[PDB]
């Protein structure tokens, strides 16, 4: 079938400025009735896709003027002018020509913004969870930019590894920051064998590394 190529990762853009995404194809992209059936779609994080431009260069319902599609032959381009922080998402190109309708590898649009230090929070295990056999300790790194951040779990000043797991939010649609959570899982007994639990965070936006901590029983 026809191969569509986006071949474009981040290179983060600033709001207000413009940016273009490419779609490299192999076929004519011209139905012998006048039209070209290249389509641009956006999928916002955790949402169903939506239509941007339908015939290579025509605008669907709602999409503002700043979006323009146009290319040369088989290399098509979507240009977004006056970038908003809510334009984060994955931009896919599809076609309605050869009957196996094929998408491209999409492109993730990352918006640039001013360095933001993460706000750090630590949550000890609930007593209810401690009734059972496990103790979960959560560390939150809220609303930071850029993506690269570093954290270390520390039980009575000793490094931890193997026993932690992290999840990361997508770039926010409104303030274009990232958030991150790490969970440290221990047996109840092992948890009761120690006092100081600490999360230590290092980020570009921090003067020195920040350390949030608690003590078993308060």
């Amino acid at each position: 079938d026809i191969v569509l190529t986006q071949a474009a990762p981040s290179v983060p853009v600033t709001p207000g400025e413009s940016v273009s995404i490419s779609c490299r194809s192999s076929k004519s992209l011209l139905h012998s009735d006048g039209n070209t059936y290249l389509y641009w779609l956006l999928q916002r994080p955790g949402q169903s896709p939506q239509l941007l431009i339908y015939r290579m260069s025509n605008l669907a319902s709602g999409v503002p003027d700043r979006f323009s599609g146009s290319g040369s032959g088989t290399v098509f381009t979507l240009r977004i002018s006056r970038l908003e922080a809510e334009d984060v998402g994955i931009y896919y190109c599809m076609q309605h020509l050869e009957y196996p309708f094929t998408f491209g590898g999409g492109t993730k649009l990352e918006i640039k913004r001013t360095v933001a230090a993460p706000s750090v929070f630590i949550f000890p295990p609930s007593d209810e969870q401690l009734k059972s056999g496990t103790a979960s300790v959560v560390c939150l790194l809220n609303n930071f930019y850029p993506r690269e951040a570093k954290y270390q779990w520390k039980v009575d000043n000793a490094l931890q590894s193997g026993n932690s797991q992290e999840s990361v939010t997508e770039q926010d649609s409104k303030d274009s920051t990232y958030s991150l959570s790490s969970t440290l899982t221990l047996s109840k007994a092992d948890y009761e064998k120690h006092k100081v639990y600490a999360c230590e965070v290092t980020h570009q936006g921090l003067s020195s590394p920040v350390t949030k901590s608690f003590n078993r029983g308060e």
Binding site: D1, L41, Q43, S48, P49, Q50, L51, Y54, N58, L59, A60, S61, Y92, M94, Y99, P100, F101, T102, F103, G104, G105, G106, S119, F121, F123, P124, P125, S126, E128, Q129, S132, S136, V138, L140, N142, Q165, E166, S167, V168, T169, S179, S181, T183, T185, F214, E218
Partner: protein, 212 residues
């Protein structure tokens, strides 16, 4: 506006039928498949009135589409782990009015459905930031995906982060949903997370409170 009834858990080798109901029109539909962390893929096309159904090269023997006139149906069979994915039904009208459903997750696994435990991530304010304080809900040890978290029955949405679920080595899923909140408002105002895990018929309202 069109919804599709999803959240399916089936064992490797079974078969499923997914619905797709329409609350506005029914002409022109299309199905698509998205691997949990991958690009979109095209299933096929069905004409609402006449079952004229083209299919993709890899869904020929797998996909089968029907319509009742005011819903559409997609039946898959012989499901492997490579079929664990989200399935969308979309009805584009050829011009500028393409609609899409919220998707249907199909998990292909031998694992049993397990309801989640919901634990508070209690704020302190005394031992928290100065301006705002973070609280949350840990939704631990559930299968299959997905779970959905809301706060104060959808009323509280500003500064809510519901994280992606992580699959633990135990083979069970677990996600955290946090929200930041002015520390002044603590104790006085109520914060409640509403966890919903449809595959196990589990709804939990967990009141998150400062530690006493």
């Amino acid at each position: 506006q069109l919804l599709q009834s999803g959240a399916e858990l089936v064992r490797s080798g079974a078969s499923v039928k997914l619905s797709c109901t329409a609350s506005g029109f029914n002409i022109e539909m299309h199905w698509m498949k998205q691997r949990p962390e991958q690009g979109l893929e095209w299933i096929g096309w069905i004409d609402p009135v006449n079952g004229d159904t083209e299919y993709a090269p890899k869904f020929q023997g797998k996909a089968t589409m029907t319509a009742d006139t005011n819903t559409a149906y997609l039946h898959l069979n012989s499901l492997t782990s490579e079929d664990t994915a989200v399935y969308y039904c979309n009805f584009y009208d050829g011009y500028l009015f393409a609609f899409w459903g919220q998707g249907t997750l199909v998990t292909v696994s031998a694992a049993s459905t397990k309801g989640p435990s919901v634990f508070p991530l209690a704020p302190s304010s005394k031992s928290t930031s100065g301006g705002t304080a973070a609280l949350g809900c840990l939704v631990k040890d559930y299968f299959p995906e997905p779970v959905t978290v809301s706060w104060n029955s959808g009323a509280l949405t500003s500064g809510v982060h519901t994280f992606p679920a992580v699959l633990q080595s135990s083979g069970l899923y677990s996600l955290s949903s946090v929200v930041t909140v002015p520390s002044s408002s603590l104790g006085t105002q109520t914060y409640i997370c509403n966890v919903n895990h449809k595959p196990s018929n589990t709804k939990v309202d967990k009141r998150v409170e400062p530690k006493s």
